[PDB]
Amino acid sequence: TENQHLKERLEELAQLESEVADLKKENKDLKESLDITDSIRDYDPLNASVISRNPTNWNDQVEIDKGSSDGVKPDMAVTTPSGLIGKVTTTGAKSATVELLTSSDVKNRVSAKVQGKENAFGIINGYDSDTKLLELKQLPYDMKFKKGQKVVTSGLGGKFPAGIFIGTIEKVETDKMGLSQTAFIKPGADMYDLNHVTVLKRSAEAGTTD
Amino acid sequence: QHLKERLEELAQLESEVADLKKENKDLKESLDITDSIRDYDPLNASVISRNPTNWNDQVEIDKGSSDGVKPDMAVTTPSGLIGKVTTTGAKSATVELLTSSDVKNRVSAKVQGKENAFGIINGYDSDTKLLELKQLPYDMKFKKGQKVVTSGLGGKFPAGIFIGTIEKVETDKMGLSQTAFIKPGADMYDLNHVTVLKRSA
Amino acid sequence: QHLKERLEELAQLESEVADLKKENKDLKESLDITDSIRDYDPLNASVISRNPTNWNDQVEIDKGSSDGVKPDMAVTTPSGLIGKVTTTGAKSATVELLTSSDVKNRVSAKVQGKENAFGIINGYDSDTKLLELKQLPYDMKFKKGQKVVTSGLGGKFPAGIFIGTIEKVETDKMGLSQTAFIKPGADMYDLNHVTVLKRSA
Amino acid sequence: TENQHLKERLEELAQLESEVADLKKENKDLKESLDITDSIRDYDPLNASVISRNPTNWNDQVEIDKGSSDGVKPDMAVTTPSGLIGKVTTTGAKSATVELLTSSDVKNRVSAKVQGKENAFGIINGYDSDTKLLELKQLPYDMKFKKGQKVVTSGLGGKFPAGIFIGTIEKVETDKMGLSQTAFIKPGADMYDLNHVTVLKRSAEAGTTD
Amino acid sequence: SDVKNRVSAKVQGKENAFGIINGYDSDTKLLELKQLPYDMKFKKGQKVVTSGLGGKFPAGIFIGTIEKVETDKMGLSQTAFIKPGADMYDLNHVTVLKRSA
Numbered sequence: 001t002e003n004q005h006l007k008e009r010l011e012e013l014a015q016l017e018s019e020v021a022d023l024k025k026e027n028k029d030l031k032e033s034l035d036i037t038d039s040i041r042d043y044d045p046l047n048a049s050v051i052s053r054n055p056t057n058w059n060d061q062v063e064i065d066k067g068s069s070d071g072v073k074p075d076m077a078v079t080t081p082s083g084l085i086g087k088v089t090t091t092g093a094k095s096a097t098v099e100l101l102t103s104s105d106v107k108n109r110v111s112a113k114v115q116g117k118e119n120a121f122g123i124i125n126g127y128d129s130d131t132k133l134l135e136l137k138q139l140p141y142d143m144k145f146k147k148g149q150k151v152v153t154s155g156l157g158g159k160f161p162a163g164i165f166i167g168t169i170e171k172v173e174t175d176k177m178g179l180s181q182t183a184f185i186k187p188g189a190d191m192y193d194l195n196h197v198t199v200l201k202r203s204a205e206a207g208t209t210d
Numbered sequence: 211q212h213l214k215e216r217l218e219e220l221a222q223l224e225s226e227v228a229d230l231k232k233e234n235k236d237l238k239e240s241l242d243i244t245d246s247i248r249d250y251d252p253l254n255a256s257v258i259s260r261n262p263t264n265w266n267d268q269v270e271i272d273k274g275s276s277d278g279v280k281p282d283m284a285v286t287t288p289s290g291l292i293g294k295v296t297t298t299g300a301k302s303a304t305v306e307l308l309t310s311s312d313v314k315n316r317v318s319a320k321v322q323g324k325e326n327a328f329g330i331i332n333g334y335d336s337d338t339k340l341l342e343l344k345q346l347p348y349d350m351k352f353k354k355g356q357k358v359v360t361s362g363l364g365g366k367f368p369a370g371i372f373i374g375t376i377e378k379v380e381t382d383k384m385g386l387s388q389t390a391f392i393k394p395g396a397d398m399y400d401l402n403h404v405t406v407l408k409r410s411a
Numbered sequence: 412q413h414l415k416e417r418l419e420e421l422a423q424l425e426s427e428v429a430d431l432k433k434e435n436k437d438l439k440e441s442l443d444i445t446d447s448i449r450d451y452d453p454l455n456a457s458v459i460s461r462n463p464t465n466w467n468d469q470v471e472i473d474k475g476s477s478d479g480v481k482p483d484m485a486v487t488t489p490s491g492l493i494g495k496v497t498t499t500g501a502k503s504a505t506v507e508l509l510t511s512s513d514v515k516n517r518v519s520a521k522v523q524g525k526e527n528a529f530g531i532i533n534g535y536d537s538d539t540k541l542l543e544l545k546q547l548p549y550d551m552k553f554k555k556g557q558k559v560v561t562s563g564l565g566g567k568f569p570a571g572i573f574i575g576t577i578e579k580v581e582t583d584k585m586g587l588s589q590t591a592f593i594k595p596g597a598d599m600y601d602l603n604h605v606t607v608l609k610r611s612a
Numbered sequence: 613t614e615n616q617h618l619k620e621r622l623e624e625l626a627q628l629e630s631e632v633a634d635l636k637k638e639n640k641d642l643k644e645s646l647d648i649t650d651s652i653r654d655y656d657p658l659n660a661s662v663i664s665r666n667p668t669n670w671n672d673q674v675e676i677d678k679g680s681s682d683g684v685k686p687d688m689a690v691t692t693p694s695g696l697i698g699k700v701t702t703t704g705a706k707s708a709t710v711e712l713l714t715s716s717d718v719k720n721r722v723s724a725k726v727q728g729k730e731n732a733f734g735i736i737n738g739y740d741s742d743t744k745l746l747e748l749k750q751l752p753y754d755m756k757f758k759k760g761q762k763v764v765t766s767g768l769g770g771k772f773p774a775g776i777f778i779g780t781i782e783k784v785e786t787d788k789m790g791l792s793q794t795a796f797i798k799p800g801a802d803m804y805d806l807n808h809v810t811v812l813k814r815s816a817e818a819g820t821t822d
Numbered sequence: 823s824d825v826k827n828r829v830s831a832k833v834q835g836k837e838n839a840f841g842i843i844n845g846y847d848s849d850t851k852l853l854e855l856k857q858l859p860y861d862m863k864f865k866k867g868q869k870v871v872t873s874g875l876g877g878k879f880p881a882g883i884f885i886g887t888i889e890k891v892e893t894d895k896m897g898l899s900q901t902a903f904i905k906p907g908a909d910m911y912d913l914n915h916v917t918v919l920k921r922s923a
Contacts, residue, residue, distance in 0.1 A: 006213060013216050016223040023230035030237040034244075034254045038272065040402060041229070082218030111262075115228050117581065119400050123262060138262055140399075150225050158259040158270075163229050165222040188221050205272040205302050207259020239554070289555055353440070354490055355576075355596060375556075375576075380729065395556060414618060417625050419694030422800050423777040424628040426762050429727050430653070430775050431635035438642040445646075455646045460770040460819020463723075463735060463750055471770075473650065473817040503817050519861050526875075529839070529859040531898060546898055548840040549857070550830050550875035564837075564861035587842060587857055588899075600752075601731050603652060 042203035043161040046071060048078075050194045051095065059102040059129070062086070062194055067094045077153070077160040077200045083189030084110070084153065084164045088199065098199075101134060101166075102127045102191050111157035112136060112166055114183065115150045118143065124151070124166060124185070134167060136183040143181070145172045151185055158207025161200055236403055239288040250284075250368050250407040253277060257401045258302065266309040266336065268296070269401055274303040284360070284367040284407040290396025291317070291360060291371045295406065308341060308373075309334045309398050319343060319373055320361040321390070325350060328361055331373065331392070340377055340391040348387050352379045358392055368410030437604055440489040451485075451569050451608040454478060458602045459503065467510040467537065469497070470602055475504040485561070485568040485608040491597025492518070492561060492572045496607065509542060509574075510535045510599050520544060520574055521562040522591070526551060529562055532574065532593070541578055541592040549588050553580045559593055569611030654815035655773040658683060660690075662806045663707065671714040671741070674698070674806055679706045689765070689772040689812045695801030696722070696765065696776045700811065710811075713746060713778075714739045714803050723769035724748060724778055726795065727762045730755065736763070736778060736797070746779060748795040755793070757784045763797055770819025773812055831855060831885055832873040833902070837862060840873055843885065843904070852889055852903040860899050864891045870904055880922030 031039060048066040066072050068091045076088045078098045086100040087110070099108060101124070109125040114136070120143050126135035136151060149169045155162030171184040240254070259270035273279050275298050283295045285305050293307040294317075306315060308331070317331045321343070327350050333342030343358060356376045362369030374392040381388055441455070460471035474480050476499050484496045486506050494508040495518075507516060509532070518532045522544070528551050534543030544559060557577045563570030575593040582589055643651060660678040678684050680703045688700045690710045698712040699722070711720060713736070721737040726748070732755050738747035748763060761781045767774030783796040829843045833855070839862050845854030855870060868888045874881030886904040893900055 002213065006217070010212070010216055013220065013223070016220070016227060020223060020226045020230065023227065023234060027230050027234050027237065030234060030241065034237065034240055034403075036237075036254050036256065036403070038256075040256050040258060041233075080218075081215075081222065082220075083222065115225065117579075119232075121260075121262070121265075121400075150221060150228070152225050152229065155258070156260045163225065165225045168221070188218075204256060204258050207270050207302075209259035209261040209268070209270045209304075238552075351439075378729075413622070414614065416693075417622055418618070419692075419800075421625065421628070421694075422762060422780070423693065423695065424625070424632060426727065426764050426775065426777045427632045428628060428635065429762070430764065431632065431639050433731075434653075435635060435639050435642060438639065438646065438648075441646055442642065455648050457648065457650075457652050457816060459652060459767070459816050460821035461733075461768045462821040463733070466733075469821070471819050471821045503819075505821075527838075529862065531860060546857070546860070548875065549842060550873070551840065562861070564859065601733075604646075604648070 038203040038205065040155045040162045040204045044071075044201040044203065046199045046201070048072075048197050048199055050197060053194070059100060059127075059191070060104055061089075062098050062100060064096055064098060064197060064199070065094070066199060067092050067096045069093050071201060072096050072199055073201075075159040076202070077164060079164055079198050079200060080189045080194070080196065082165075083187060084160075084166045085189050085191050085194065085197065087160070098197075100191050101187055102129075109157075110160065110166070111154040112151050113154040113162070114139065114145065114169065115152060116143075116145070120145070121154055121156065122183075128184075131184065132186070133170060133184040134187055136169070136185055137175075137180070139181040139183060141174065141178065141180050145169055145181065145183055147171070151183075155202070155204065156207070158210050159202060161202045161204065164200070233402065236288075240403060240405070243288050247405075247407070249409075249411065251409040253279065253406040253408055255404050255406055257404060260401070266307060266334070266398075267311055268307060269293075269305045269404075271303055271305055271404060271406070272301065273406060274299045274301050276300050278408050279303050279406055280408075282366050284371060284410070286371060286405050286407065287396045287401070287403070289372075290394055291367075291373050292396045292398050292401065292404065294366070305404070307398050308394060309336075317367065317373070318361040318363045319358050320369070321346065321352060321376065322357045322359060323350075323352070327352075328363065329390070331358075335391075338391065339393070341374055341394055343376075343390040343392050344382075344387070346388040346390060348381070348385070350388070352376055352388070352390055354378070358390075362410070365410070368407055371407075434603065437489075441604060441606070444489050448606075448608070450610075450612065452610040454480065454607040454609055456605050456607055458605060461602070467508060467535070467599075468512055469508060470494075470506045470605075472504055472506055472605060472607070473502065474607060475500045475502050477501050479609050480504050480607055481609075483567050485572060485611070487572060487606050487608065488597045488602070488604070490573075491595055492568075492574050493597045493599050493602065493605065495567070506605070508599050509595060510537075518568065518574070519562040519564045520559050521570070522547065522553060522577065523558045523560060524551075524553070528553075529564065530591070532559075536592075539592065540594070542575055542595055544577075544591040544593050545583075545588070547589040547591060549582070549586070551589070553577055553589070553591055555579070559591075563611070566611070569608055572608075650815040650817065652767045652774045652816045656683075656813040656815065658811045658813070660684075660809050660811055662809060665806070671712060671739075671803070672716055673701075674710050674712060676708055676710060676809060676811070677706070678811060679704050679708045681705050683813060684708050684811055685813075687771040688814070689776060691776055691810050691812060692801045692806070692808065694777075695799060696772075696778045697801050697803050697806065697809065699772070710809075712803050713799055714741075721769075722772065722778070723766040724763050725766040725774070726751065726757065726781065727764060728755075728757070732757070733766055733768065734795075740796075743796065744798070745782060745796040746799055748781070748797055749787075749792070751793040751795060753786065753790065753792050757781055757793065757795055759783070763795075767814070767816065768819070770822050771814060773814045773816065776812070829879065829885070830873040830875045831870050832881070833858065833864060833888065834869045834871060835862075835864070839864075840875065841902070843870075847903075850903065851905070853886055853906055855888075855902040855904050856894075856899070858900040858902060860893070860897070862900070864888055864900070864902055866890070870902075874922070877922070880919055883919075 052063040167185040255271040255273040360371040456472040561572040664675040779797040872883040
C-alpha cells in the first residue's frame with residue numbers, strides 16, 4: 001500500500017506541479033506585459049514552529065517561534081502545506097500568537113472564494129467542534145454549489161494573499177431569510193496537531209474597506 | 211513517511227491551477243485591447259479590498275495619487291466600463307461601481323444607432339441585474355441588442371467606452387422620454403484586474 | 412339605465428389598447444427589416460396554436476403547402492431566428508423552435524469574429540435559458556458578446572440569420588473543442604407574428 | 613350620482629374608444645403593408661339571446677336562439693360587452709347550448725394571456741362558487757403578478773379569437789410543486805343573469821396542436 | 823505515437839476550417855485531422871497548414887494534403903486523413919523557426 005497508490009500519486013502529483021509552474025510562469029509574463037506589480041496573490045513566506053499550546057484552549061490558539069524581529073506582524077496568514085490554519089494576533093520580539101480557524105471566537109473570520117465555473121464570495125465565520133466544519137456565510141442565493149468545490153482566500157479582507165486553500169464544501173443550505181446560502185466546509189489542513197507552519201506576508205497593498 | 215508529505219499539498223495545487231487559469235485568461239484579454247486604448251493612457255490595477263456589506267457599491271484598487279489616479283477617472287475591464295474613481299489616497303483608491311446603490315451616481319451615455327440618442331445611466335436593480343438608461347428621446351425607436359457606450363458629454367469619461375446592451379425599453383409616465391434597461395457588459399460581481407483610464411483625449 | 416351600458420365594456424377597451432399597442436410595435440419592427448431581407452422571399456404568418464404541454468418545442472402557423480411553405484425553411488422574427496418548418500399541411504404548418512427539447516434538433520452556426528469559427532447549435536437549457544453552441548475550434552478565443560448567425564452549411568437555412576449572443580464559453584472534457592452558451596436574440600416565449608424565409612438564395 | 617360620475621366616465625370612456633379606433637386603424641394598415649390576413653384577433657360576431665336556463669344547472673349552461681343555420685358552431689366563443697362568458701357546445705338547427713365559465717365541468721378550459729410589461733400564458737380551468745373566482749393555472753414561476761392585471765384569451769387553444777377580456781387577477785399563489793404559479797381571477801362579465809349575448813366566429817385558421 | 827501530440831491546423835479552402843492534427847497511422851502513413859466543421863465539404867487535395875491558434879507555431883507552415891475525409895460517429899464533426907508533405911523517414915538537414923512574428 002505504501003507504493004501501490006503513491007506510485008500513481010507522487011507521480012500524478014508532479015503532474016500538477018509542472019502544470020502549475022508553466023501557468024505560473026505564463027502568468028508572470030502576462031503581468032510583466034501589463035504593468036502589474038504586487039498582485040493580489042503574491043507573498044513572502046516565513047517558516048516557523050509551534051512552541052506552545054495549552055490544552056485548556058487547544059483549538060483557539062498556538063504560539064510560534066518567530067516574531068516582530070523576524071518580520072511577523074498581526075493579521076498575517078499562517079498556513080501549512082495542506083491549507084490555511086489561522087492568522088497572527090499578537091506579536092512579541094521573538095514569538096507570536098496565532099488564532100486558529102477552529103477558534104471559538106465568534107468575531108473570527110476570513111474572506112473567501114468558492115472556485116467554480118463561476119466564482120462566489122463569502123465570509124468564513126464559525127467552527128463546529130462536533131461536525132468539524134467551517135461556516136461559509138453569505139454566498140449568492142441564486143448560485144448553486146456542489147459538494148467538493150474548493151474554497152480559497154479571496155484577499156478581499158485586505159490582509160491575506162488570495163489563493164490559499166481553506167477547505168472543501170461538504171454541505172450546503174439556505175438561511176432562514178432566504179437572502180443567501182451557507183456552505184459548511186471541511187478544512188484541508190488538520191489543526192489538531194500542529195508543528196511546522198508558515199507565516200505569509202501579503203504583497204498586495206493593504207485594504208481599508210474592512 | 212512521505213505518505214502525507216506531497217499528498218496533502220494536493221488540493222492546494224489543484225486550486226493553484228484553477229486560479230492561474232482564470233487569471234491568465236483574463237490577463238490575456240487585457241493585452242489584446244491594449245493598443246486598442248493606448249491613447250487613453252491606461253493604468254493597470256488590482257482590486258485589493260472589497261467589503262461584503264457594500265459589495266455592489268465600491269471596490270478598492272492598488273493605485274492612487276502618486277500614480278496619476280485622480281477622482282472621476284473611468285475604470286474598466288476588457289468586457290466593459292465598471293465605474294469611476296472616487297476618493298484617492300497615496301498608493302490606493304476607491305472605485306464607485308455602476309452597480310452602486312447611490313442614487314446620485316450617474317454616467318452620460320449614448321446609444322449607437324441609425325440616429326444617436328443620448329441618455330443618463332442612473333440606477334441599478336439587484337434583481338433584474340439591469341442598468342437604468344434614463345432620458346432617451348420619446349419618439350425614437352430602440353431595439354433589444356443596441357450597444358450603449360459613454361457619451362463624453364461632461365468631460366469626465368472618454369467617449370466610446372462600452373457600457374452594455376439594450377435589454378428592455380419602456381415609456382415613462384410623463385410621456386416625455388423613454389427608459390431602456392441595460393445588461394452591463396462587464397461582470398462586476400467578480401473583479402480582480404482592472405484598468406484606470408488616465409486621459410480622455 | 413346607461414350606468415352599465417358603456418360602463419362594463421371598459422376593461423375590455425383598456426385591453427384592446429394594450430394588445431393593439433404591442434401588436435403595432437412588433438408589426439412596425441417587421442416593416443423596417445422588410446427590404447432588409449426581401450431577397451429571401453419572406454412570408455408573414457401568425458401563430459395560430461401552441462400547446463402548454465410542449466410550449467417550448469413547437470408552434471403552429473397559418474401558412475402551409477399551398478403558400479410555398481416547405482419543411483426545413485427558416486422561421487424568424489425581427490429580433491432573431493426562432494426555428495424551422497417541420498410537418499406541413501395545406502393551409503398551415505408546424506414550426507420546431509430553437510428552445511425545443513428534441514435532442515436531434517440542430518442548426519449550423521457561425522460566430523462572427525476576427526476569425527470565423529463554425530459550430531453546431533444543439534441544445535437548450537430551460538433554466539439558464541441559453542442555447543448550446545457545440546464544436547468550436549479548441550484554441551480560438553471567444554468573448555462575451557460576439558454575435559452568432561446561421562452558417563448556411565447544409566443548404567437548409569440562408570446564412571446571416573442572427574441567432575443570439577455569446578454569453579459563456581467553456582472547454583469540453585475531451586479537450587478537442589469549445590462550447591459557447593448563447594442568449595437567443597428572439598423572444599420565443601411570446602410568439603405571435605412570424606416570418607417564413609422561402610428562399611435562401 | 614347618475615350624472616356625478618358618468619360625466620367623468622362616459623366622457624373618459626369615449627376617450628379610450630377613439631384611442632382604440634386609431635390604434636385599430638394603424639394596426640390594419642400595418643397588416644396590409646405586410647401580407648397579413650385573418651390575424652389571430654379577427655372575428656365575425658353574431659348577436660343572440662338566452663332562451664332557456666334551468667335552475668338545476670344554472671351555472672353550467674345556457675341556451676341561445678341562434679344555431680347551425682345561423683352559422684353557429686361548437687367551440688365558438690360566447691361573450692357580452694363586459695367579458696367572455698363561455699363557448700358553444702352542442703348545436704341544433706336554430707338554437708344551441710353554451711357552457712359557461714362558471715361551469716362545474718373540470719375538463720372545461722380556455723387558453724389565456726395575462727397582460728403586463730411582459731405577457732404570460734396559462735390555462736383558465738376551474739370555478740369556485742364561493743370565492744366567485746376563476747383559476748389561471750400554469751403561469752411561469754419566475755414572473756411576478758400584481759392584483760389588477762387583465763387576463764384575455766390567447767387564441768392558442770385554436771378556437772377562440774385572441775383578445776377577449778376574461779377578468780382580473782385578484783389573488784396569486786405558488787403551487788405545491790414549486791414549478792408554476794396560479795392566479796385567481798374575477799370574471800369581468802356577470803354570468804348570474806344572462807340575456808343578450810354574442811357568438812364569435814374565429815377568423816384565424818383553426819389549430820390542431822390541442 | 824504519443825497520443826498527446828497535437829498541432830493546430832487550418833484547411834485552405836473557400837471557407838477556412840480549423841482542426842487539430844492529432845494522430846499518425848504507420849500503415850496508411852496518414853495524419854489525423856480531427857474536429858473539422860460537420861457540414862463543410864472538403865475535397866482530396868486541399869492543402870493543410872498550421873493555424874497559429876495557440877501561439878506555439880507560426881501560421882502558414884505547410885503540413886500536408888487532404889487524402890480522405892469521413893464523418894465520425896457522433897455526427898458532430900469530420901475527420902480528414904492527411905498525406906504529410908515532408909518526408910520524415912529520412913531526415914538529415916532541418917530548420918528551426920525561432921520566431922513566429
